[PDB]
Amino acid sequence: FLTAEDCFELGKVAYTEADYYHTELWMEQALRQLDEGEISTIDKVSVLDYLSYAVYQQGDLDKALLLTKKLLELDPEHQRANGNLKYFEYIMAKELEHHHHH
Amino acid sequence: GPRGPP
Ligand SMILES: [Mg+2]
């Protein structure tokens, strides 16, 4: 059994090597343990920051937007997550603009 | 573009 902090550190190793799948495995494990109420010094916002980017790199845009929204619920002022949200909202508005014109 | 932790 590994602490949430261990899982998070491992996910950062994966991320720094652009191993975005393993980043997702480790970060999701960390998030699960915190959600069950493990006492830990890592904060969910930073976990979600890495996780949202990793999921974006995998091409899973819906999931990346969801995670970005989860991050912003916890930290509404997060500058990059706000940036990423605006980007995802733009892409979605274009797709909906397309469906309305076709 | 989206920006992740640097
Ligand atoms: Mg995946």
Numbering used by the authors:
A (entry chain A): 144 to 245
B (entry chain E): 4 to 9
What does the paper say about this structure?
The PSB domain of the α‐subunit binds proline‐rich peptides, but its function with respect to the prolyl hydroxylation mechanism is unknown.
Calorimetric binding studies show that the affinities of these peptides are lower for PSB‐I than for PSB‐II, with, respectively, K D values of about 70 μM for PSB‐I and 20 μM for PSB‐II.
